[PDB]
Design a protein around this ligand. Structure first.
Ligand SMILES: O=c1ccn([C@@H]2O[C@H](COP(=O)(O)OP(=O)(O)O)[C@@H](O)[C@H]2O)c(=O)[nH]1
Ligand SMILES: O=c1ccn([C@@H]2O[C@H](COP(=O)(O)OP(=O)(O)O)[C@@H](O)[C@H]2O)c(=O)[nH]1
Ligand SMILES: OC[C@H]1O[C@H](O[C@@H]2[C@@H](O)[C@H](O)[C@@H](CO)O[C@H]2O)[C@H](O)[C@@H](O)[C@@H]1O
Ligand SMILES: OC[C@H]1O[C@@H](O)[C@H](O)[C@@H](O)[C@@H]1O
Ligand SMILES: OC[C@H]1O[C@@H](O)[C@H](O)[C@@H](O)[C@@H]1O
Ligand SMILES: OC[C@H]1O[C@@H](O)[C@H](O)[C@@H](O)[C@@H]1O
Ligand SMILES: OC[C@H]1O[C@@H](O)[C@H](O)[C@@H](O)[C@@H]1O
Ligand SMILES: OC[C@H]1O[C@@H](O)[C@H](O)[C@@H](O)[C@H]1O
Ligand SMILES: OC[C@H]1O[C@@H](O)[C@H](O)[C@@H](O)[C@H]1O
Ligand SMILES: [Mn+2]
Ligand SMILES: [Mn+2]
Lengths: 439, 448
């Protein structure tokens, strides 16, 4: 009765596609990921891989076709089918609407005139019968052709497409901040008076969807999650501790190593990466920590990749961990699209200054609407944020499969986060407990 | 494993408070019984005095019929809802008391005897004192404490406070894991993921208790909670029609001293689409000169009326009472169909939100009240501008009100406090724990 075709063309899965899959599963939506396992080469490749997928669907199924990296469903098939039937009694293909006419601004005068601001087609989500969609795309396109232009022209030049002007099925979120609010585990659009099913953080609006993600749920919360706030795994995966130290500040080095040594975890290997090139501390340090390296000024992944460890645990010398069972606690949260997790810590004398950024502007720190709420623990959980620092747990499927060594901002911590953002790998801050402090 | 919730609901007729409790219990698969159903309350005026001993007396009676040693929750129902189910409750109980003691709610204040302050255990937290509106333990242990009974007008909270201080039978839920007494805890509490989160204790309390004046906080939060995922297509089609119309009694409050206003209003009322109706006109005018003309169109016409009247309705076979004031202009013709479709469970009094024609953010509901008059609530403007839509539990509604017969037939809606018909109707409903729901789902009309 319904199949969702999510476009997810990549050799390795992004967190965007993993999040999409989790929300489909939560809402009982049957899906397939179009292009899974293939190399990405705009957006016409979406149409070409779609055509392949449709060729293998024999019968005339009702389908949704949608983006995955920046999009989640918030309801299930029953609501979707009610809305489709209302929107198009004669079974045409329904496309998302949006605020802007692109990529060809000259189509403005060829679109139907409407009272609403939601005037134009967005190709990132649509719904209709397999045969009808197949008929429109059956000749293929160029990989580097624009899929949005392709369908905009079809809308203007044929009677095959209807636009979702009232945002019943689909929401293109960009520049619609003032219309949207989180209410009862949904987005409500007060301009249209609707609860859109598919939330599309199109273009820069990935930041708004990622912001809202921490307020949605895929299942009711277990309110006893932290009633007992001690954690111990049944089976411990191997964790590679990557310690970024500076023996030029010997007092800080000693304080930090003492705290790391008190983290309770059996199945570990510890590497020290010292930015100093002065060899005078090697004898003393190596007695306790043989895997000691000097003159290191970048984050290092080669030792990890050559190991059999399952997790990379990055620790900076100015981050003091006091919660001894923290690795057990953190590993219990690594599932689905949660693969990079950073415990929230603040300066002792200044607890509003923490190791995460809630927002970013032109690459630098911006105060988000919920930053102070998070930093003061007014709400707790996992939070999709643009930058995390100094205490970072990463699953091997991130470190082994993606380039984390891209350069833009020169500072090692800013370039790690830049790399993750570029790959659609999400950083989750966690503030469930008192974990430590920065010095 | 097993759990039974014993909600205290001593009344001949059910309040909306108990109906809301029952709905949330059912939503969370909590097995429950209502203690005291069918009996008259004789426990005192708890809004302004000590009391509540009758709750212990009716509990005792109820426990006599639970022969085996079941794990039970006992709780208030008029101002209290559960937000999770039995699995979470049992995990928390077992963590809080490995030796199976009776767990009581905590609260901020030492009530009703302020001199017990020096007798309580000293603790770091502000949640220092016992609240008897929710507790959990084994039937035999609770039975043992209450087996002799008390006076109906005795204070139940005092009774258990003394037991906590003088025995080892009770422990307090200091961290608000099972229970939250919400009064004066506003800054601690936030709505998040269909729960209350307490940032002071770092907990998600199961039972949300609007104790004392905090009924206003719980009623406010109610509009943001759900008992089931919402149906996002609820207003995709915004026309409504009942094929089998229940009988509706239209009670029109009119003033023929402004004849042009009266005619404009009646022309809108006559375009409300509804067949199975009876229409009464209650005119505040004492001038009889318009009787002959009006009665041609509306034979059920009465003059000199300055109060809301329910006796004609009670003599009828109508199932709903639809109150309409002359300055309320209804433009949505299918409105009664729309409103009747929302009447279920604890939703029995429903008022469509309309604004003044020249000033749409001044509406026919009040979000808060101070010494009886309007006060601006935290979400009033959001509601007035349709930033969020639905049903909202508010202290005052005016001018367009649909009431189920189970309210009108069974409760005194004619109590006097302000000597003002609209203010005194809402006062009466608040007194009885009958809730007023504003609804803002569609464009309904306007006030003049
Ligand atoms: O490596 C890639 C890049 C993009 N896409 C798909 O193309 C969609 C459109 O790109 P994006 O959503 O970034 O564009 P926007 O909606 O911001 O214009 C993404 O969600 C994916 O579904 C993909 O499958 N693989
Ligand atoms: O007519 C009444 C009045 C009170 N109660 C019960 O007594 C409790 C305590 O009164 P309330 O909760 O109104 O007050 P508070 O917790 O503020 O004392 C109610 O919740 C009911 O469970 C009752 O059963 N019938
Ligand atoms: O008096 C018995 C009554 O006590 C509790 O209710 C209120 C209490 O929490 C508050 O501190 C005082 C003063 O505002 O008012 C009390 O009515 C308890 O919640 C209730 O169940 C109990 O019967
Ligand atoms: O990168 C290792 C360390 O280098 C030092 O020079 C800085 O003061 C620390 O904040 C940092 O943790
Ligand atoms: O929009 C998602 C959330 O954003 C936060 O910044 C606000 O404080 C919340 O009230 C809101 O639910
Ligand atoms: O109560 C009936 C009517 O009386 C008139 O005098 C008032 O101006 C109206 O606002 C009211 O609806
Ligand atoms: O506390 C319940 C609700 O109250 C409203 O007044 C706020 O605007 C919401 O953000 C909040 O969730
Ligand atoms: O010393 C006790 C600790 O030993 C660690 O190896 C283990 O990871 C912890 O869970 C705890 O058992
Ligand atoms: O006529 C009574 C009405 O008066 C209006 O001025 C007010 O906004 C309404 O809430 C209601 O009180
Ligand atoms: Mn997209
Ligand atoms: Mn109570």
């Amino acid at each position: 009765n319904l199949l969702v075709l999510g476009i997810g063309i990549s050799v390795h899965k992004t967190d965007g596609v993993l999040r999409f899959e989790k929300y489909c599963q939560a809402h009982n939506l049957q899906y397939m990921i179009v292009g899974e396992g293939k190399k990405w080469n705009g957006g016409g490749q979406k149409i070409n891989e779609l055509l392949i997928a449709l060729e293998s669907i024999k019968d005339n199924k009702l389908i949704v076709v949608c983006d995955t990296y920046d999009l989640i469903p918030l309801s299930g098939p029953e609501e979707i089918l009610r809305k489709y039937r209302f929107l198009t009694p004669d079974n045409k293909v329904v496309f998302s609407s949006e605020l802007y006419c692109w990529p060809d601004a000259s189509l403005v005068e060829r679109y139907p005139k409407v009272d609403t601001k939601y005037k134009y087609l967005n190709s990132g989500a649509f719904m209709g019968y397999r045969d009808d969609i197949y008929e429109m795309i059956k000749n293929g396109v160029k990989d580097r052709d624009d899929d949005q232009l392709f369908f905009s022209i079809k809308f203007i030049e044929t009677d095959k497409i209807v636009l979702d002007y009232k945002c019943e099925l689909f929401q293109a979120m960009y520049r619609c901040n003032s219309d949207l609010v989180v209410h009862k585990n949904r987005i409500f659009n007060g301009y249209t008076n609707s609860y859109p099913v598919f939330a599309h953080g199109n273009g820069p609006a990935k930041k708004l969807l990622n912001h809202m993600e921490g307020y949605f749920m895929t299942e009711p919360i277990d309110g006893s999650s932290n009633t007992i706030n001690t954690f111990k795994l049944d089976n411990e995966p191997k964790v590679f501790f990557a310690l970024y130290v500076d023996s030029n500040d010997l007092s800080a080095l000693k304080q930090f190593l003492g705290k790391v040594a008190s983290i309770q975890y059996g199945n570990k290997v510890i590497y020290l990466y010292d930015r100093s090139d002065n060899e005078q501390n090697r004898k003393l340090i190596q007695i306790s920590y043989p895997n000691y390296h000097t003159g290191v000024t970048k984050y290092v992944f080669d030792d990890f990749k050559k190991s059999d460890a399952q997790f990379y645990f990055l620790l900076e010398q100015n981050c003091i961990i006091t919660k001894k069972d923290i690795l057990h606690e953190l590993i219990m949260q690594v599932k689905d699209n949660h693969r990079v997790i950073s415990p929230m810590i603040g300066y002792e004398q200044n607890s509003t200054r923490t190791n995460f950024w809630g927002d970013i502007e032109d690459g630098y720190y911006k105060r988000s609407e919920n930053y102070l709420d998070l930093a003061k623990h007014k709400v707790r959980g996992l939070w999709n944020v643009p930058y995390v620092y100094g205490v970072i747990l990463m699953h091997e499927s991130v470190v082994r499969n993606w380039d984390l060594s891209m350069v833009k901002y020169n500072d090692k911590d800013m370039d790690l986060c830049f790399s993750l953002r570029k790959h659609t790998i999400f950083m989750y801050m966690i503030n469930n407990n008192n974990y430590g402090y920065m010095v």
